[PDB]
Amino acid sequence: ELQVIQPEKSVSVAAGESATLRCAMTSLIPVGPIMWFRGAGAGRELIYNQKEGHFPRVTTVNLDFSISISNITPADAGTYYCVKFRKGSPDDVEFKSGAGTELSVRA
Numbered sequence: 840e841l842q843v844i845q846p847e848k849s850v851s852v853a854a855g856e857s858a859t860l861r862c863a864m865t866s867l868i869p870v871g872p873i874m875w876f877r878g879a880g881a882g883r884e885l886i887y888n889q890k891e892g893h894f895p896r897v898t899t900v901n902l903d904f905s906i907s908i909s910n911i912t913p914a915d916a917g918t919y920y921c922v923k924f925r926k927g928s929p930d931d932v933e934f935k936s937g938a939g940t941e942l943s944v945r946a
C-alpha cells in the first residue's frame with residue numbers, strides 16, 4: 840500500500856528565510872487529501888490543505904506534496920507531518936503519516 844515519504848528528518852532555517860518541507864506519496868490510492876500539520880496530537884495545527892482553507896504563508900512546490908512556508912520566525916519551530924487521508928463519510932480518515940520533519944530556526 841501507499842507510503843508517505845518525507846526525505847528530510849530536519850531542516851535548519853535562518854529566521855526570515857523560507858522553509859521547504861518535502862513530501863511525496865508513493866500511490867494515488869486510496870483517494871483522499873494530503874495535508875500538512877504542525878504536531879501529531881489531537882491538538883495538531885493544520886498548516887496546509889489544497890482544496891479548502893486559507894493558508895497565505897504556504898506555497899506548493901501528482902505525487903509531490905512539498906510546500907514552502909514564507910518568512911520563518913522562531914515561533915514556526917516544530918515538527919511538521921505530511922498526512923494522507925482516505926475519503927470517508929461523513930469525514931475523511933487519516934490513512935498514513937509521514938515520519939515528520941523538524942523545522943529548527945537559526946535566530
Ligand SMILES: [Cl-]
Pocket residue numbers: 868869870
Ligand atoms: Cl480509493
